[PDB]
Subunit: 245 residues, 4 copies
């Protein structure tokens, strides 16, 4: 089988991924690394494709190694930005047969949410995102919410900004500004991963909400990317381009 390594194998999501890869008939687990394991275990193990669920502070280093070594990468780790994507692209120039796919959410409901928010955005005066996650999460706002806001922003190019009469305010009250879209981050015990996109116009609102109750919700999207990763050399952002929508 296709030889698959996992980075972050002891994390909440990574350990789930290990089980998934092990269990898949067509995939063979070549490596399971967590913090402090050297990356050369991947190359020693003849790994073809790596799944990465680590931490924002280490993921670019992992990618740089993967790409130099011709190893395809399916990355779920967040903390990405346009500059980090440009950087990944620039490393791939040297390794034009290597495929990297980076997605802030592998759960189909979250992918659909982003696609729908994009379609809905131009019909409303106002748009915001609220995201809600467990309180072990390193990054705020979430990768999914940041990507969602950019999509909405892009789709509302040439329309007026959100109306807002706010004239007196506590700092941080109105959330983070992501391309003119307010984005709010709740961190709460009991939660896993959640987001509500909110649109408003006269007398009405539309809410597009996603809930991952279990980290098993990330598995199908990941395995799909792993199995299809070689079709798209270079960088793919998001799961959406592997789907027919």
């Amino acid at each position: 089988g296709m030889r698959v390594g996992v980075l972050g194998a002891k994390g909440k999501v990574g350990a789930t991924m290990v089980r998934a890869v092990a269990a898949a008939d067509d995939l063979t687990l070549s490596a399971e690394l967590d913090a402090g394991d050297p990356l050369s275990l991947l190359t020693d193990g003849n790994t073809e494709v790596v799944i990465d669920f680590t931490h924002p502070d280490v993921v670019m280093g992992n990618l740089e190694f993967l790409i130099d070594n011709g190893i395809h990468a399916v990355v779920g780790t967040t903390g990405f930005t346009a500059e980090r994507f440009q950087q990944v692209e620039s490393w791939l120039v040297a390794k034009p047969n290597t495929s990297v796919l980076i997605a802030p959410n592998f759960a189909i409901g979250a992918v659909l949410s982003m696609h729908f928010a994009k379609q809905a955005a131009r019909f409303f005066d106002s748009a915001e995102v609220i995201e809600l996650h467990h309180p072990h999460k390193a990054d705020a706002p979430s990768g999914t919410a940041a990507r969602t806001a950019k999509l909405i922003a892009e789709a509302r190019k040439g329309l007026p900004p959100n109306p807002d009469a706010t004239s007196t305010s506590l700092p941080g009250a109105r959330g983070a500004d992501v391309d003119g879209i307010p984005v709010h981050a709740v961190r709460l015990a009991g939660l896993v991963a959640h987001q509500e996109v909110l649109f408003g116009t006269e007398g009405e609102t539309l809410t597009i909400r996603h809930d991952s109750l279990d980290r098993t919700s990330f598995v199908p999207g990941v395995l799909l990317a792993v199995r299809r990763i070689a079709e798209r050399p270079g960088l793919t952002v998001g799961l959406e381009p592997l789907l027919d929508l």
Copy 2:
């Protein structure tokens, strides 16, 4: 201006519609009828197009009159079914220049909801609709929710039904069966018009929710249908075909 009558002119929505028509520059109010006003006021007033927000028990009678008299109709009244649509179509055979558009929801957020539910349906194991409305509403479930469920059902043709292990149950607990989609109707003081489409699969859910807080949310969709009604001779169901999506 285009001569516009309103049926149900004293109702919650109709009275709003009267104000909207009166206020539009390009539209002239030809008649304002409520219960007990004869329909010939419409023809006496040379009405070209009628807006109908009445009651399920009277709307087919109104339509029969409109159609016989060559009067275009934009209908928001609910209580429609496939058989009532066939009937309307059959009356239109005799009056092939008359346009009728019937839509259970004129608010853009609700239209988008239906379009999105249609797109989302095949990705999930489970789908349900919950609708919530003020407690003066004659019909349950709502027209919007019934239409939404049929769309979902249509889109999931050839997939397995919703899983459900329910083996002991109070009657009505699992909602109404609309083409295999459970549909639940809340009737609550304080509400206006609300719906949540819910989809589920392993470890995740997607919720598509619409809220009309004010009956002003129905106005743009109605005025758009009124202004475009003559482009589509015959019967149009829903606002979606007048939109680019």
Copy 3:
């Protein structure tokens, strides 16, 4: 330690309970039974207290055995009714030192929900319950929702029923009637255990919502009942009487 048996040890909740009991310092696991294990394993093992998470069809039989044998019981299995409570009480007449506590929800958020719904009920014209659970659930509506509705009903004794103009309806649309409170049951893949109590009056609504994302949310309530079970001889319904509120 206090000797604790579990019935339903292989179920979703029971297996969690086994781990919890095993892990507690002050509790000793005396038995782990699932379907087809004879109940005399409990008495052979000198079990003092049993935790029950089985099925509505078997729980009364289990209770009858526990009570005859003087074994205290902390029951989470649902499907209970006033008649089943009377029956349990009637068996306890013969064994007046035996304590039984039966609770449809051991999660603190659900307990609080019930207490709050009770306090809120008399301020509103309208009340409904919607509950949403995984699609392996045998019973609809849920035990928590049924108990919640009775509490609300009790608290609204002598007030008018929910207003409702519904004059045309699909069967089951308006939910199950629990003491005049509409109760609706969603069964959806991705879910665990969820409920929203809804109250309405002029221009406003109040929603009290609980989500158990993980079955670990039932553990503290159970262990608390297990450790305190002997303080209340006879039958206790709900976790609320063990709490200060």
Copy 4:
């Protein structure tokens, strides 16, 4: 009848209040002032009690005049803080027969929410507030949400703060800090007034949500305060002390 003035008589809420006072049998409208009307109209009209729904920038000036002139005040205008309350108290020292009641929310569902959040707070590891309002609102976060967070904070005195691993963050992402409670403010077309208090602990969350769909929801609370205002000389904060809970 009791002579009642309204400040902010042309605003969204004030105009509703004017209608309510006019319509009440036991209340006589003595004045209707909006921006630019001199306050001496109140004293010329022999006003006994004033209802204030104006703007944060003017309300303290209005109160100073009311209090100097011995006129009781029922204030819904937000923008209040502990220092503004101390100030109001200090003015009342000189006029010890004058009653002032200041409440950030007059709708019963919002009052109940605050009372419930207070009761719930000590059972959870985490608490946040999200508030959502129309985009004409001057202040963020809302008065109701700020008061709610202080109540929660007070109730969690001596417990650990909300857990949060956030190590990389966009500014404003985590909301405003109100006594250690994250508070987030959505401003969206279509909205009126909305709030969700969120509590979390292991595997579970509790959400207490309020929606005012219409400004009529503020009327009963206001009229109740107006009719009872003389019972409590001095300053009352909130509607809760006029209710039995």
